[PDB]
Design an enzyme around this catalytic site. Structure first.
Site, PDB file in Angstrom:
ATOM      1  N   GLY B   8       0.789  -1.226   0.000  1.00  0.00           N
ATOM      2  CA  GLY B   8       0.000   0.000   0.000  1.00  0.00           C
ATOM      3  C   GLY B   8       0.827   1.284   0.000  1.00  0.00           C
ATOM      4  CB  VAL B  13      -0.814   5.396   5.698  1.00  0.00           C
ATOM      5  CG1 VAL B  13       0.262   4.994   6.706  1.00  0.00           C
ATOM      6  CG2 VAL B  13      -2.111   5.793   6.390  1.00  0.00           C
ATOM      7  CE1 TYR B 137     -10.938  -0.388   6.373  1.00  0.00           C
ATOM      8  CE2 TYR B 137     -11.701   0.136   8.593  1.00  0.00           C
ATOM      9  CZ  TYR B 137     -10.732   0.225   7.612  1.00  0.00           C
ATOM     10  OH  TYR B 137      -9.578   0.948   7.867  1.00  0.00           O
ATOM     11  CE  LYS B 141      -7.896  -2.221   7.946  1.00  0.00           C
ATOM     12  NZ  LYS B 141      -6.658  -2.358   7.128  1.00  0.00           N
ATOM     13  N   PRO B 164      -4.471   3.157  14.258  1.00  0.00           N
ATOM     14  CG  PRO B 164      -3.359   3.603  12.278  1.00  0.00           C
ATOM     15  CD  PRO B 164      -4.130   2.525  12.981  1.00  0.00           C
ATOM     16  NE  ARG B 209     -15.715   9.863  13.133  1.00  0.00           N
ATOM     17  CZ  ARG B 209     -16.910   9.694  13.665  1.00  0.00           C
ATOM     18  NH1 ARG B 209     -17.151  10.053  14.922  1.00  0.00           N
ATOM     19  NH2 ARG B 209     -17.880   9.171  12.923  1.00  0.00           N
TER      20      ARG B 209
HETATM   21  N1  LIG Z   1      -7.223   6.801   6.014  1.00  0.00           N
HETATM   22  C1  LIG Z   1      -7.705   6.569   7.244  1.00  0.00           C
HETATM   23  O1  LIG Z   1      -8.510   7.348   7.766  1.00  0.00           O
HETATM   24  C2  LIG Z   1      -7.252   5.346   8.011  1.00  0.00           C
HETATM   25  C3  LIG Z   1      -7.455   5.307   9.391  1.00  0.00           C
HETATM   26  C4  LIG Z   1      -7.034   4.191  10.100  1.00  0.00           C
HETATM   27  C5  LIG Z   1      -6.427   3.136   9.418  1.00  0.00           C
HETATM   28  N2  LIG Z   1      -6.249   3.176   8.081  1.00  0.00           N
HETATM   29  C6  LIG Z   1      -5.595   2.030   7.439  1.00  0.00           C
HETATM   30  O2  LIG Z   1      -4.360   2.448   6.870  1.00  0.00           O
HETATM   31  C7  LIG Z   1      -4.050   1.667   5.722  1.00  0.00           C
HETATM   32  C8  LIG Z   1      -3.756   2.603   4.570  1.00  0.00           C
HETATM   33  O3  LIG Z   1      -4.932   3.340   4.238  1.00  0.00           O
HETATM   34  P1  LIG Z   1      -4.894   4.625   3.263  1.00  0.00           P
HETATM   35  O4  LIG Z   1      -5.718   5.719   3.890  1.00  0.00           O
HETATM   36  O5  LIG Z   1      -3.448   4.932   2.907  1.00  0.00           O
HETATM   37  O6  LIG Z   1      -5.670   4.015   1.996  1.00  0.00           O
HETATM   38  P2  LIG Z   1      -5.481   4.546   0.480  1.00  0.00           P
HETATM   39  O7  LIG Z   1      -4.847   5.917   0.447  1.00  0.00           O
HETATM   40  O8  LIG Z   1      -6.765   4.299  -0.300  1.00  0.00           O
HETATM   41  O9  LIG Z   1      -4.379   3.545  -0.134  1.00  0.00           O
HETATM   42  C9  LIG Z   1      -4.657   2.159  -0.202  1.00  0.00           C
HETATM   43  C10 LIG Z   1      -3.411   1.432  -0.663  1.00  0.00           C
HETATM   44  O10 LIG Z   1      -3.700   0.030  -0.751  1.00  0.00           O
HETATM   45  C11 LIG Z   1      -3.413  -0.406  -2.078  1.00  0.00           C
HETATM   46  N3  LIG Z   1      -4.381  -1.427  -2.519  1.00  0.00           N
HETATM   47  C12 LIG Z   1      -5.726  -1.345  -2.469  1.00  0.00           C
HETATM   48  N4  LIG Z   1      -6.265  -2.487  -2.964  1.00  0.00           N
HETATM   49  C13 LIG Z   1      -5.259  -3.288  -3.334  1.00  0.00           C
HETATM   50  C14 LIG Z   1      -5.114  -4.618  -3.953  1.00  0.00           C
HETATM   51  N5  LIG Z   1      -6.205  -5.351  -4.270  1.00  0.00           N
HETATM   52  N6  LIG Z   1      -3.867  -5.084  -4.185  1.00  0.00           N
HETATM   53  C15 LIG Z   1      -2.761  -4.379  -3.882  1.00  0.00           C
HETATM   54  N7  LIG Z   1      -2.834  -3.165  -3.321  1.00  0.00           N
HETATM   55  C16 LIG Z   1      -4.025  -2.585  -3.040  1.00  0.00           C
HETATM   56  C17 LIG Z   1      -3.516   0.824  -2.953  1.00  0.00           C
HETATM   57  O11 LIG Z   1      -2.802   0.634  -4.170  1.00  0.00           O
HETATM   58  P3  LIG Z   1      -3.273   1.316  -5.550  1.00  0.00           P
HETATM   59  O12 LIG Z   1      -2.607   2.670  -5.474  1.00  0.00           O
HETATM   60  O13 LIG Z   1      -2.744   0.381  -6.595  1.00  0.00           O
HETATM   61  O14 LIG Z   1      -4.779   1.384  -5.451  1.00  0.00           O
HETATM   62  C18 LIG Z   1      -2.956   1.891  -2.045  1.00  0.00           C
HETATM   63  O15 LIG Z   1      -1.527   1.927  -2.109  1.00  0.00           O
HETATM   64  C19 LIG Z   1      -5.258   0.806   5.464  1.00  0.00           C
HETATM   65  O16 LIG Z   1      -4.968  -0.521   5.888  1.00  0.00           O
HETATM   66  C20 LIG Z   1      -6.364   1.431   6.283  1.00  0.00           C
HETATM   67  O17 LIG Z   1      -7.329   0.459   6.658  1.00  0.00           O
HETATM   68  C21 LIG Z   1      -6.636   4.252   7.374  1.00  0.00           C
HETATM   69  C1  LIG Z   2     -11.334   6.137   9.750  1.00  0.00           C
HETATM   70  C2  LIG Z   2     -12.593   6.005   8.870  1.00  0.00           C
HETATM   71  O1  LIG Z   2     -13.721   6.071   9.724  1.00  0.00           O
HETATM   72  C3  LIG Z   2     -14.930   5.905   8.981  1.00  0.00           C
HETATM   73  O2  LIG Z   2     -15.993   6.473   9.779  1.00  0.00           O
HETATM   74  P1  LIG Z   2     -16.008   8.076   9.932  1.00  0.00           P
HETATM   75  O3  LIG Z   2     -14.954   8.512  10.843  1.00  0.00           O
HETATM   76  O4  LIG Z   2     -17.402   8.460  10.205  1.00  0.00           O
HETATM   77  O5  LIG Z   2     -15.584   8.398   8.411  1.00  0.00           O
HETATM   78  P2  LIG Z   2     -15.757   9.732   7.604  1.00  0.00           P
HETATM   79  O6  LIG Z   2     -16.408   9.384   6.327  1.00  0.00           O
HETATM   80  O7  LIG Z   2     -14.401  10.374   7.569  1.00  0.00           O
HETATM   81  O8  LIG Z   2     -16.700  10.644   8.520  1.00  0.00           O
HETATM   82  C4  LIG Z   2     -18.100  10.795   8.249  1.00  0.00           C
HETATM   83  C5  LIG Z   2     -18.580  11.781   9.312  1.00  0.00           C
HETATM   84  O9  LIG Z   2     -18.313  13.130   8.844  1.00  0.00           O
HETATM   85  C6  LIG Z   2     -19.559  13.737   8.390  1.00  0.00           C
HETATM   86  N1  LIG Z   2     -19.268  14.464   7.144  1.00  0.00           N
HETATM   87  C7  LIG Z   2     -19.522  15.754   6.951  1.00  0.00           C
HETATM   88  N2  LIG Z   2     -19.119  16.093   5.721  1.00  0.00           N
HETATM   89  C8  LIG Z   2     -18.596  15.011   5.154  1.00  0.00           C
HETATM   90  C9  LIG Z   2     -18.043  14.814   3.951  1.00  0.00           C
HETATM   91  O10 LIG Z   2     -17.946  15.728   3.117  1.00  0.00           O
HETATM   92  N3  LIG Z   2     -17.573  13.532   3.617  1.00  0.00           N
HETATM   93  C10 LIG Z   2     -17.682  12.520   4.541  1.00  0.00           C
HETATM   94  N4  LIG Z   2     -17.225  11.297   4.270  1.00  0.00           N
HETATM   95  N5  LIG Z   2     -18.246  12.792   5.724  1.00  0.00           N
HETATM   96  C11 LIG Z   2     -18.693  14.010   6.038  1.00  0.00           C
HETATM   97  C12 LIG Z   2     -20.533  12.586   8.280  1.00  0.00           C
HETATM   98  O11 LIG Z   2     -21.894  13.021   8.524  1.00  0.00           O
HETATM   99  C13 LIG Z   2     -20.073  11.715   9.437  1.00  0.00           C
HETATM  100  O12 LIG Z   2     -20.461  12.280  10.704  1.00  0.00           O
HETATM  101  C14 LIG Z   2     -15.080   4.451   8.827  1.00  0.00           C
HETATM  102  O13 LIG Z   2     -16.371   4.117   8.274  1.00  0.00           O
HETATM  103  C15 LIG Z   2     -13.995   3.960   7.906  1.00  0.00           C
HETATM  104  O14 LIG Z   2     -13.847   2.588   8.140  1.00  0.00           O
HETATM  105  C16 LIG Z   2     -12.607   4.707   8.007  1.00  0.00           C
HETATM  106  O15 LIG Z   2     -11.516   3.808   8.390  1.00  0.00           O
END
Ligand SMILES: NC(=O)c1ccc[n+]([C@@H]2O[C@H](COP(=O)([O-])OP(=O)(O)OC[C@H]3O[C@@H](n4cnc5c(N)ncnc54)[C@H](OP(=O)(O)O)[C@@H]3O)[C@@H](O)[C@H]2O)c1
Ligand SMILES: C[C@@H]1O[C@H](OP(=O)(O)OP(=O)(O)OC[C@H]2O[C@@H](n3cnc4c(=O)[nH]c(N)nc43)[C@H](O)[C@@H]2O)[C@@H](O)[C@H](O)[C@@H]1O
Ligand SMILES: NC(=O)c1ccc[n+]([C@@H]2O[C@H](COP(=O)([O-])OP(=O)(O)OC[C@H]3O[C@@H](n4cnc5c(N)ncnc54)[C@H](OP(=O)(O)O)[C@@H]3O)[C@@H](O)[C@H]2O)c1
Ligand SMILES: C[C@@H]1O[C@H](OP(=O)(O)OP(=O)(O)OC[C@H]2O[C@@H](n3cnc4c(=O)[nH]c(N)nc43)[C@H](O)[C@@H]2O)[C@@H](O)[C@H](O)[C@@H]1O
Lengths: 321, 315
Positions: B8, B13, B137, B141, B164, B209
């Protein structure tokens, strides 16, 4: 065709096991209505950890209905050894079977769960609601969790595609065609084999653990008849518990004794308290199954233990041991 | 001598981890290898096996996964379940059989029990079902932890994970429909600046959040690969006092981007999980003196990055 009573091509996986041979037994016995085509398979027909084989199996049969019994099963002591193999192999088997049924377009799937898998820290009696309400006992968490993820995959297929993929939750099961291997099998068959070797050797019987843990035991045939009714009449996605009642729960000690009585054993009875008792108690409710089939009668425990020991005894060479 | 495989690597990240090692946080005798899906679809065993064969990873940091905001998860819990399960089993099993010294997968504060005490900590991860909006999801995890515990218990593999909170940063997914709140709110305000529109923030604006800047995460993650030898996962989050409401988050963005229009809330849209307040107490027993990047400052640097790389950015 009939809109109201429709043709069934039914695929039963894990059809050669304890639970599978019972369904064959009842179905061969005349509980199979006309316009139902039953196909029972085993791992010889296709290794369900493998995707290609499963899908191929699912193409060759064109099942409208699935009973998914195929799973790596074992007693307390087998699970303790291989939590990783119970996890990887069952989840592959379940993902392959559910997803194959999906894309084949099967009308219904009833997978098979267990009372094993409920939260260790719990209120009693347990019921269908409480399935994900805390972690499972650490002895068998690999198996536990692989089963829990059936419930999970079921709701997802249903919430996203309207698939009627559900499950049953049996308590500890026993009967003919069980695994009687003492090391790797369950308490009742393991005691039976043990009582058989004991009578034959002049040996004592060694009951593992303390003997105080409590269990609910369902006879394979009683379970098979509910299983049949479930596939046909029951159409929720939330699973249903198939268990003998609350009052019919028993200690390991009485279980042992029951086997003893039945097999006319007259030697000493000893407990190895160094061995693991596992989960003490997983008392479960059948109130739900009661609201469906209030007047079903389970085959009394001691009777079922008679029939099971007689089965083992007159099939000793063919049995799994 | 370390040969580190980062799956990834091309995501939010991942880029962050790439910025910091390149920036200088690489220690000598570390052969950092970042990959993305063009290197291998980790949902395919064969491909996953082959990547792990060519590269020979002493260590693995497993960021690879199907990820999305609330509204993508709601729609697609069957995919979120299946695809992630496949990736993780494939990566964890390949890793095992190449015989890596250590793997660090990535959990989330998402996946905790809906019904719970606050703050939430490492101990509680399996103490009840997750919320229903993202159960697929979430469950996928959790099972990483289950699987982690299985490899360590049967073969002793040092397979752990980090938990995280909501992340955000440069190279985020700014797709409004599919992405998380902050980058979506950023994409919104920009289209609003160009258009003269009002900003519509989805929900009531009350949910709470914990945001963590990818660049901060990056480092903590890097530290973890090196120094963190518990199998039990570790929460990586801003402190319990630094939790922000969505209105505050919306405001933060509007300031950075100098948006003068009207700010409005579509209260009909889902709020998802109201609160998932997580405790970083464990992390502080290791790194007492790690200062997190102030939230507004970090928001400005993402708005700055986004505006300045709109065309390259995932929109
Ligand atoms: N973003 C958040 O808010 C958040 C919070 C907590 C934890 N996490 C965790 O942090 C990790 C990274 O998330 P992110 O936010 O960096 O996601 P992201 O920006 O969407 O990036 C996802 C990465 O996974 C790769 N990937 C997706 N599907 C794949 C497949 N079938 N085979 C190989 N590679 C694949 C993507 O490659 P391509 O570029 O080829 O698509 C990309 O490099 C995840 O495990 C996520 O669950 C994220
Ligand atoms: C960390 C992430 O947490 C996710 O929950 P969660 O924090 O609500 O994920 P988000 O989509 O970041 O947050 C949605 C929250 O933000 C409000 N919101 C307001 N404006 C927007 C907007 O423009 N876009 C989005 N998306 N929301 C918005 C929405 O009503 C809700 O309370 C998990 O479902 C996933 O698994 C992910 O890993
Ligand atoms: N017994 C209990 O106490 C109990 C209690 C609650 C729930 N359950 C559940 O009920 C179901 C049936 O259990 P059981 O007691 O009948 O187990 P069993 O007697 O050991 O039978 C297992 C069945 O699964 C098949 N199987 C195993 N691995 C396979 C693979 N890789 N590919 C294809 N088929 C495979 C076996 O076929 P082969 O003959 O080819 O090996 C056999 O037919 C299981 O899902 C179990 O979790 C059992
Ligand atoms: C339903 C089954 O429940 C399993 O737990 P569980 O009821 O303890 O499964 P069993 O192995 O049937 O029960 C083990 C209990 O019976 C005692 N015991 C006494 N003698 C014997 C014996 O000869 N053999 C065995 N095996 N036990 C014996 C043992 O100490 C422990 O308290 C779960 O681990 C599985 O997942 C499975 O699905």
């Amino acid at each position: 065709e009939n809109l109201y009573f429709q043709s069934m091509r039914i695929l039963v996986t894990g059809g050669s096991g304890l639970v599978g041979k019972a369904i064959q037994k009842v179905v061969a016995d005349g509980a199979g209505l006309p316009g139902e085509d039953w196909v029972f398979v085993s791992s010889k027909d296709a290794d369900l950890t493998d995707t290609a084989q499963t899908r191929a199996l699912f193409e060759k049969v064109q099942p409208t209905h699935v009973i998914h019994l195929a799973a790596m099963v074992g007693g307390l002591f087998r699970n303790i050894k291989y939590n990783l193999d119970f996890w990887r192999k069952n989840v592959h088997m379940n993902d392959n079977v559910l997803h194959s049924a999906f894309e084949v377009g099967a009308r219904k799937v009833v997978s098979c769960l267990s009372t094993c898998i409920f939260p260790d820290k719990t209120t009693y009696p347990i019921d269908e609601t409480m399935i994900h309400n805390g972690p499972p006992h650490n002895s068998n968490f690999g198996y536990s969790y692989a089963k829990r993820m059936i419930d999970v995959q079921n709701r997802a297929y249903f919430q996203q595609y309207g698939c009627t993929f559900t499950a049953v939750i049996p308590t500890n099961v026993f009967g003919p065609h069980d695994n009687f291997n003492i090391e790797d099998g369950h308490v009742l068959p393991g005691l039976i084999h043990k009582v058989h070797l004991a009578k034959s050797s002049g040996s004592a019987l060694t009951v593992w653990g303390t003997g105080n843990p409590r269990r609910q035991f369902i006879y394979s045939l009683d379970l098979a008849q509910l299983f049949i009714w479930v596939l046909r009449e029951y159409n929720e996605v939330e699973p249903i518990i198939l268990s003998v009642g609350e009052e019919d729960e028993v200690s390991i000690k009485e279980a042992a004794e029951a086997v003893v009585e039945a097999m006319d054993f007259h030697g000493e009875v000893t407990f190895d308290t160094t061995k693991s008792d596992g989960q003490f108690k997983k008392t479960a409710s059948n109130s739900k199954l009661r609201t469906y089939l209030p007047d079903f009668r389970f085959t009394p425990f001691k009777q079922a233990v008679k029939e099971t020991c007689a089965w083992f005894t007159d099939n000793y060479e063919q049995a799994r041991k």
